[PDB]
Each structure stands twice: as C-alpha cells, then as structure tokens.
Design a protein around this ligand. Structure first.
Ligand code: HEM
Ligand code: HEM
Ligand SMILES: c1ccc2[nH]nnc2c1
Lengths: 137, 137
C-alpha cells in the first residue's frame, strides 16, 4: 500500500525522482517555463547533468517526508504551509501541483510494479486542497 | 536527536553517503579486500566510478529506512534478516558493519554540527547484535 510505496521510492530515490519528473515535463511541456534551464534537452541529456539529479533527489526527499507524515493520505496543514511559503515556490498555483500528481499516478500505473496508484491519486488531490487552505491560489 | 539526524542526512544524502563511506575506507584500508575495484584510487577517482556512486547511495537510502523503523535505536529483527540474506553480503561478517559505524560516529563528532553521535554509536552496536541473532558470522 501507500506506506510500502514510500519505502519502494526511497530505496532508489535518485532514479525514481528523475524518471517521474521527466514524465511530468514530457506530459505538460508548457510547465517547463518554471524550469527555464532545462529547455532544449532530451531525457538523457538532462540525466547526464549532475545538477538535474541533485535537485530532483532533494525535491523527492521532501515529498516522501510529507507523504510519510500524512494520515490516510491527508497531508498535515503545516507541511502544506511549508510548500506554499518556500521562496522557490513563489507565484506557483495549485494547478502546477495537480499536474505533477496526474503525471506521477500515470507513471506508477505504467510501471508494471505494485504501486497503490489509488492512494497516490488521493494524496495529490488532498495536497491540492491543503495548499489552497494554506494560501496558494 | 536521532530522528532529526535522519532528516539532516536525508536532506544532503548523496554527499553525506560518499563522504562517510570514504571515511570508512580510509580509516580501514584493508576493507578494500571486499571492494577489489576500489584499489589504487583517490577519493575523487572513486566518486567518478558509477558503481561506487551506486552502492553508496543504496547503502545510505536503506540504512536511513532501518534507522527510521527502529525503536530507541534498536532495529527491527526483519530488517536484520534482510541484510544478512542479501546475496551481495555473503562474504561479510559483523566486523565489517562494526567498522562502518565506528567511522560514521567519528565523522559526526568531527563535523561541528549538532548530530547525536551517542545515539548513532548505540544504533551501530544494536544493528551488529541483531545481525548476529539473524545469522551473520
Ligand atoms: C509536493 C511537491 C513538491 C515538493 C516536495 C517540492 C520541493 C522542492 C524542493 C525541496 C526544492 C529545492 C531543491 C534544491 O535544493 O535543489 C524545490 C525547488 C523548486 N520547486 Fe518544488 N516541490 C514540489 C512541487 C513543485 C511544483 C509542482 C513546481 C512547478 C511545476 C515546483 C517548482 C519549483 C521550482 C521552480 C524550484 C526552484 C528550482 C531550483 O531549486 O532552483 N515545485 N521544490
Ligand atoms: C547498514 C549497512 C549497509 C546497508 C544498509 C547496505 C545495503 C546494501 C545495499 C542496498 C546493497 C545493494 C547496492 C547495489 O548493488 O546497488 C548492497 C550491496 C553491497 N554491500 Fe552493502 N549495505 C551495508 C553495509 C555493507 C558493508 C559494511 C559492506 C562491506 C564492508 C558491504 C558490502 C556490500 C557489497 C560488496 C555489496 C555488493 C557490491 C557493491 O555494491 O559494491 N555492505 N549493500
Ligand atoms: C518535480 C516536482 C517538484 C519540483 N520542485 N522543483 N523541481 C521539481 C521537480
């Protein structure tokens, strides 16, 4: 279930982080505007750069902490507030997060492994509603 | 304390993992008997070898999970059974693990941060005793 999936992702976090972030950028090419430095590069070109993996790994470490602290796939309000207030997230809206979790669930369903894709879809929806309650437009 | 230290290490895991594992190999150079490929290499040459980067990341990803599942720095018996039975660990004895943790604790004490070094010393001793009970020589 959801708790085991956190362990699966953590066990090979740098690899999963890169693959899931590429699935997001490829599904929603207009989202690369938040990431101007990745424009004009294929998947393999992005992965060869240490900065890409370094950054994504740190992102997914925080995502897994939020997921592990959730109750029944409902994140804590205090974790949603951290995500809203981070300077790096200034001017994001909840739709950016909605799209990230649609891509993440699609990746899990195509992987042919035993992810609890329903729990992740629910986590993404509950994270969007928590971000709005914590002040994100 | 110990739980916060897991969060500290996870926030810069790649760099902490390679640095601690290098501290282990430089304190105990005979431990290269298990890593014949690492002979004749400086730290900066090891860091640019793909499989050094791979073992080391996966060592620390899993070690952080074992730490997180522990109670008062005592690991789960099931976690010890998994570590003993890994086909990659067939040539190992508990002394290989003891030495890793002696190096890890020395690294934390020298860092000048706020690690709970005493807790990591207990965790390494308790992991060793759990590995023995699970079947490691
Ligand atoms: C639960 C979801 C998310 C988490 C856990 C998260 C976490 C983080 C973290 C930890 C960093 C700093 C990483 C580093 O040190 O390099 C970061 C940076 C950033 N995030 Fe997110 N993020 C999330 C969702 C998003 C989304 C949906 C977007 C946009 C589509 C976004 C855009 C950015 C940008 C633009 C940066 C700055 C790039 C940089 O580090 O220079 N994030 N995020
Ligand atoms: C808590 C401590 C440790 C954990 C959690 C751990 C975990 C792992 C993991 C997850 C793997 C698979 C890595 C991969 O192939 O990508 C692995 C392989 C290995 N572990 Fe460990 N390990 C630990 C300690 C050690 C120690 C102390 C030694 C030797 C002194 C050792 C020697 C190996 C060797 C030789 C392999 C296979 C070849 C290699 O990865 O270079 N491990 N270990
Ligand atoms: C994937 C999901 C969230 C992110 N925040 N910065 N970079 C990210 C990549």
């Amino acid at each position: 279930g959801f708790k085991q999936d956190i362990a699966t992702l953590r066990g090979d976090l740098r690899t999963y982080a890169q693959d899931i972030f590429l699935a997001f950028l490829n599904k929603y090419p207009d989202e690369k505007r938040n990431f101007k430095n990745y424009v004009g590069k294929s998947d393999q070109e992005l992965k060869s750069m240490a900065k890409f993996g370094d950054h994504t790994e740190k992102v997914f470490n925080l995502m897994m902490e939020v997921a592990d602290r959730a109750t029944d796939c409902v994140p804590l309000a205090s974790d949603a507030s951290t995500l809203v207030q981070m300077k790096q997230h200034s001017g994001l809206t909840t739709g950016n997060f909605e799209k990230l979790f649609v891509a993440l669930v699609e990746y899990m369903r195509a992987s042919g492994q035993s992810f609890d894709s329903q729990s992740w879809d629910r986590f993404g929806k509950n994270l969007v509603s928590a971000l709005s309650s914590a002040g994100m437009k």
